[PDB]
Design a protein around this ligand. Sequence first.
Ligand SMILES: O=c1[nH]c2cc(C(F)(F)F)c(N3CCOCC3)cc2n(CP(=O)(O)O)c1=O
Ligand SMILES: O=c1[nH]c2cc(C(F)(F)F)c(N3CCOCC3)cc2n(CP(=O)(O)O)c1=O
Lengths: 49, 71, 261, 181, 48, 33
Amino acid sequence: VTTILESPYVMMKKNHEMLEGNERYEGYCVDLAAEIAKHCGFKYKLTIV
Amino acid sequence: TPKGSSLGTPVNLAVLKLSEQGVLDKLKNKWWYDKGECSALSLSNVAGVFYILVGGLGLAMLVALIEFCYK
Amino acid sequence: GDGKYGARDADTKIWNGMVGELVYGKADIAIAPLTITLVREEVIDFSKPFMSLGISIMIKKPQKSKPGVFSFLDPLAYEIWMCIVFAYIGVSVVLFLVSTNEFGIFNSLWFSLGAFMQPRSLSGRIVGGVWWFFTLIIISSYTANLAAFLTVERMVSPIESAEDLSKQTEIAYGTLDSGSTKEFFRRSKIAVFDKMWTYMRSAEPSVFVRTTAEGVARVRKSKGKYAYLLESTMNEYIEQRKPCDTMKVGGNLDSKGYGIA
Amino acid sequence: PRSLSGRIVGGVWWFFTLIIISSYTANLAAFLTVERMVSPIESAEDLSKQTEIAYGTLDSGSTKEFFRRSKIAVFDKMWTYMRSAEPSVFVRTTAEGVARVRKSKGKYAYLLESTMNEYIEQRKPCDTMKVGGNLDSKGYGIATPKGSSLGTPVNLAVLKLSEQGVLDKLKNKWWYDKGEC
Amino acid sequence: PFMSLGISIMIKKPQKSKPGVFSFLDPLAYEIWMCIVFAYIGVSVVLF
Amino acid sequence: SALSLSNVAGVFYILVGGLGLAMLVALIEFCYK
Ligand SMILES: O=c1[nH]c2cc(C(F)(F)F)c(N3CCOCC3)cc2n(CP(=O)(O)O)c1=O
Ligand SMILES: O=c1[nH]c2cc(C(F)(F)F)c(N3CCOCC3)cc2n(CP(=O)(O)O)c1=O
């Protein structure tokens, strides 16, 4: 899943230095992402453009 | 999505399923308003009544200066 | 030994504390403030509640009225008390030039008596009128402004029910970081407590305290700008200790119970 | 004339009265703006510190027998009043007790179960209200025959409903949500 | 138990109505009326 | 919750102070006579 770093859609969470992968980020499109993956059934990893 | 993808149709449907379920509405409320951050006086008003006062002092000081010349 | 009430570590599947010392054979009975929770009633037996409780709200003791003389110099700002005096002596000096070294002292004593507010010389006539129009706006503004302070001072309603906490935000509020109290709001689905959790979940800075003690001091060091939520039993007891600067308000939030186990 | 002596007395007394009659003009506007209310009856210790406002309970019931048997400091004074109160502060039914408060203009307090108290407060015409904390510590329960097979089942199921928040949700439904106030 | 309770007090809510020549003595407090009469006679004794 | 005597009090002291001030300037009046 490609996405842009933009508030409040996709933002770096505060303690991002300690986390890895997908938990690193948070926002609107972030929560939207998983919800899209729920009603379609697939694993995914968010990458910044 | 890339043209003619496998995810094409299902995603399009799945998105609409999220609209009338009000979760798109609720998500906006979460990051826009839910997580968002959002008895005294002044002199500015009183000042406008102060200049007309001194102006009433400067006009009558002029009427004072014209009444002694006539007499 | 451990100083905990009763919990079930999901990992090791081992109970701890008083509730635990019943199960593993150590103790015969438990006489303490033990919460009758379902997770425990399955493994041990409880008596009927020997004290009906719940979650309450600990607010600062509404300090008694009031500040001092400094509430008089507040409606009409200090700067405005000045200009009204400069203009005051600015009028009586204008009137002084409308009327040999002593003849200007009694007239200045007469122009200051005509200044201490309450013939047809068109000069000094329009000075007295404008001044009257000037002092009129000020005293009208003073009455209007002071009325506002005393209007809101009547409006500031004492935080009573928990729904009051949800309706406003001027007085921040939180619970303990970990415990049955905080777990209620996060899990509760009642309209009132829902919004309460939503606010407290994202609240910055931390509305959550580490120890229960950090909550009481936070209500005593906010002068009423902070409220703490906890069990009713611990709450009522706090109000009966020095310096008598905290109080319980409104009804409880839920219906718990302590029982002999 | 311009007697500089009492000239400032006339001047200073004027400032003294300007403020005062303005402070009255102000705070009175607030009195006509908010018009807040107060209820005299706070606690049960407030019922035994006065006599102007009468009070009573049911003639026969647990509520009556409570004060009659109670040996707590405050509650003792309440029963000594009711037993020899003229006229009989004891009403016949619950409806008569509510009607005795609704027709006393606030000179008659009534003591009942806190359950139906809150219900009465949510039935028309929204005149009464519960005041202060409850007097004792009781509780309703599910009753099953001694040695039943439903014993342990229902009991455990009760606790599951409360922690889930079902009971709190249910009481809000038939008291306040479908209430009329 | 499925609902905690006890005995409570029921009272009748007071209406907005409260006539009488008393709510005029309420704003300007009683003590102030005294001193607005004490400083009052304190003025007439100064000028006298 | 009525009207505070605090605020109003401060104006009572500028008064009796002014009364005493012109109980002073009054006393100096009669002197020069
Ligand atoms: O059975 C239990 N009984 C408890 C009884 C009390 C008290 F009120 F003191 F009696 C307290 N507090 C101690 C200090 O913080 C405030 C309340 C905690 C209890 N806990 C832990 P929790 O319910 O998980 O938070 C239990 O488990
Ligand atoms: O088991 C009992 N449960 C009861 C339950 C209720 C109610 F609240 F309606 F559920 C009442 N009220 C009926 C109307 O007046 C107010 C209270 C009385 C009850 N009584 C009789 P008491 O306790 O001897 O007075 C019981 O015995």
